[PDB]
Design a binder for these strands. Structure first.
Lengths: 325, 122, 111, 111, 110, 111
RNA sequence: GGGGCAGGCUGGG
RNA sequence: GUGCCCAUCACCU
RNA sequence: UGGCUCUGCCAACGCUACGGCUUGGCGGGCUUAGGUGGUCAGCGGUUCUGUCCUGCUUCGGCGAACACGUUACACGGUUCGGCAAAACGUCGAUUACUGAAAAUGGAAAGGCGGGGCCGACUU
């Protein structure tokens, strides 16, 4: 937007923005200690947050780091997730706009499901013969937080948004915290560097990245292997990302992308998905939880409406009775 | 910044009130509909609806299980008011759907009150 | 101090909110009367608190302040025709927060 | 005993229509009658969340006060009078709730 | 016993309620508060009789005392005369009768 | 009691005219002020019978709330209903009933 | 031998 | 813990 | 919000301190977001009883073990063309430029995209 971006802390701390940040931070969390302790004097809280951010006296409270099974999930205080949400409402849409189309992570109107569809689509057309799928080792745990802030900084220009970004995410380490809206954004942005070594350099026009996973359909498995080598060398030397898994498969193994396995023709969810679901259902039955199963079923009936599962839905209706579709 | 602290933070009181605010936010519109007449029933319903928040709140701050049971009695009285506003109020006051919706919300506040009563009872 | 200070700081809440609470349409009349009874009746909660030093009395002063913030939330939104424009909630919450601070200090001083 | 509330709720269902009828003239009487009628449910409810016989006697007092309200609303005069029929045909309903309250008081008293 | 006091207090109400409805709207809060004290002392008696703590039989006495206050207050409340001095005298006689019964009842419990 | 109420009657007799001068606009504050003013008699009276000091401190809280109401009606009530002089004169009368309440508190907590 | 799926027996939750 | 998306629930345009 | 401590009128329950009040009409005045689940980036451990798989490799790994036609074997709003001017994105660039200083100013040509555009057909 003329590039620059040199006055974002004015928009981050607009009451009208911090109130959006507040409503976004609380959305879903309105049964949490953080919302409920904040909600008390919310607009008085947001007035001391607005004016913490508008001063450059905002300091991010320590991440409460638990872990679910194997992640490393660092939580934030509600005030801090609100500052993140108030950044990532101005700061996010000035990064998520540079995110090439085919980055499907944490950006509005692109998702898990618009990604698998992009891939199938782009696999459908192009008549892709082959594909490179890659993945970043411990991404959020290998994102430079330093060459990230050379991208959060070719686009923030506002020397106080920059210092708020650097409170909410320090500019030193190799640990973008996982479990930050601020960090979902800055990981898409960082992994956006490899998208601009696929699409820009490398002239790869058929790809999709969803945060750390990167499909790259080709036609010469030798070219896609090149692309991959070029992508890994880049993302290692420039972004400090080890590539955990990669492959250059013919489009036939199926692109295990984002939840689905995506052939040109059948985005066959994934067998993992079936068995996970089969098991989830079976468990739900023999847990007496056959009412949250309807919620789950309705969920998985969406992940599988596009994937091909008529017979599988008949099969699951015959095994347990439950209304799949 | 650290949000403006109230004293005696009862996660349970804070949560129950936020969930009961949804009961109020559902019921207050339909209480402020109980016709011009039925105004005493409405004022008494509204004093039961909007005044259950104080019952929860005082239960939260005065960590005394008596005040938590008084909050439960009020939720029970609010459930009565749903019964009453549906059945006994003659124009309509509350459509059967509205009682079904409100009872779900009051049930959510009932759950939280129950959990809160239990955690205090231990 | 303590009760005298809290009440003088709470008088600012009343002085801000009473005008708002007198504006609440008569339609939102029960809400208004109950808000006014919460607003002007929190003085009694403070008054009782500084006549006992029973720390439960300063917690029920906090409960009242909590209820008063509920009222702001309610009259901010749950009140259809409205009754405490979002700005009014913000301004009032700052004043109630100042009363909250003094109540907290008072709770602590008793602790 | 929560058949009490569900047998009292037909007292309310009988008495509320004729209370939401005591003209404004008798409007404080009405508000107080309605608070006695619709607010006896709270008396029962509190009794049933405690089974303290104290709260059960308070429920009985309320039914007795509701019986007073019937006798009072009878001789309120003018065409706003609770007709003698209604005083009797509500005293029947209140008596049914009275019986159940008595049995409940007894069940608690002889544990 | 609660039944007797209430039937004698019903005479106070039956005298005062007409008078308490005549208290001008100007004195409307006082009126509604007097009416709530007048009808409303019935509940004080009734609670006293359907239970027993003698505190409830004192709260009935407090209510009768408050009702006496209301008579004296409404007598000469302002230019809109609420209660004529005669009305206070008549009502005070009736309240005194229920006062006597309350006193005897307090004593019988004590 | 008897003497506290007779001295408080003078507060009411001074303040009730002031409370009736509060415009319609501030009618709910007036009703709430009048319920504090005229309803402190009940607080005194109930202490008079049930001599428990708890009931006596609630009478003190009510006098304190009535003093708040003077402050409120003089200024926070936006047409500063009570003039500062009237607050001064009312506070003298409330102070007299305050003295008697204090002496009564003291007489009760002799041991 | 390893492996996936459904049930055995036990943590997290 | 994070977002994006699914379901369902209220609730008016 | 069955208001009004709100008036005029008229009644009449009444109450009257005889003024009215009250009360009644009757005017009139004042009166998409959220919730909650469930996924996606992204719960196991051990033996047992069935059950099935045990291929590939570019040596990184990818699989497999029945969604079984692993596929509604048929595509799309995941459509098919045409463009890519604009705008968007992006590099150029927090550059030139301006100004002592880019200092919360600031381009652009150009380069690269498709995300965008225009039709068709379908939605």
């Amino acid at each position: 937007m003329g590039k620059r971006h040199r006055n974002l802390i004015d928009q981050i701390t607009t009451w009208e923005n911090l109130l959006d940040a507040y409503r976004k931070t609380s959305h879903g969390k309105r049964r949490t200690w953080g919302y409920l302790e904040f909600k008390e004097y919310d607009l008085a809280n947001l007035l001391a947050l607005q004016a913490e951010l508008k001063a450059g006296n905002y300091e991010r409270g320590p991440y409460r780091e638990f872990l679910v099974y194997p992640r490393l999930i660092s939580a934030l205080e509600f005030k801090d997730r609100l500052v993140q949400h108030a950044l990532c409402n101005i700061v996010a849409p000035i990064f998520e706009a540079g995110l090439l189309p085919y980055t499907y992570a944490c950006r509005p109107d692109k998702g898990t499901h618009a990604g698998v569809c992009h891939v199938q689509a782009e696999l459908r057309r192009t008549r892709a013969t082959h594909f490179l799928k890659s993945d970043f080792s411990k991404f959020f745990p290998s994102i430079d937080r330093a060459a990230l802030y050379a991208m959060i900084d070719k686009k923030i220009h506002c020397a106080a948004t920059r210092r708020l970004l650097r409170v909410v995410l320090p500019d030193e380490g190799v640990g973008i915290p996982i479990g930050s809206l601020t960090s979902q954004l800055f990981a898409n942005v960082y992994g956006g560097a490899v998208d601009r070594l696929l699409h820009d350099e490398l002239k790869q026009r058929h790809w999709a990245r969803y945060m750390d996973d990167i499909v790259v359909l080709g036609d010469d498995p030798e070219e896609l292997r090149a692309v991959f080598y070029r992508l890994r060398d880049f993302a290692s030397e420039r972004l400090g990302l080890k590539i955990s898994h990669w492959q250059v498969a013919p489009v036939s193994r199926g692109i295990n992308f984002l939840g689905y396995r995506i052939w040109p023709t059948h985005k066959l969810l994934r067998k993992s998905s079936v068995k996970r679901a089969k098991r989830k259902v079976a468990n739900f039955i023999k847990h007496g939880e056959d009412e949250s199963l309807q919620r789950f079923l309705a969920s998985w009936s969406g992940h599988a409406q596009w994937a091909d599962t008529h017979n599988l839905f008949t099969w699951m209706e015959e095994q347990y009775g439950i209304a799949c579709h | 910044m650290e949000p403006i602290e109230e004293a005696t933070k009862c996660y349970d009181q804070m949560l129950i009130v936020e969930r009961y605010e949804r009961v109020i936010s559902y019921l207050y519109p339909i209480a402020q509909s109980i016709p011009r007449k039925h105004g005493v029933a409405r004022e008494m319903f509204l004093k039961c609806l909007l005044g259950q928040v104080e019952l929860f709140i005082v239960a939260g701050k005065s960590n005394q299980v008596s005040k938590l049971y008084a909050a439960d009695a009020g939720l029970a009285m609010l459930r009565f008011w749903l019964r009453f506003l549906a059945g006994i109020q003659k124009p309509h006051a509350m459509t059967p759907h509205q009682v079904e919706t409100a009872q779900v919300l009051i049930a959510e506040v009932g759950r939280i009150l129950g959990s809160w009563i239990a955690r205090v009872n231990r």
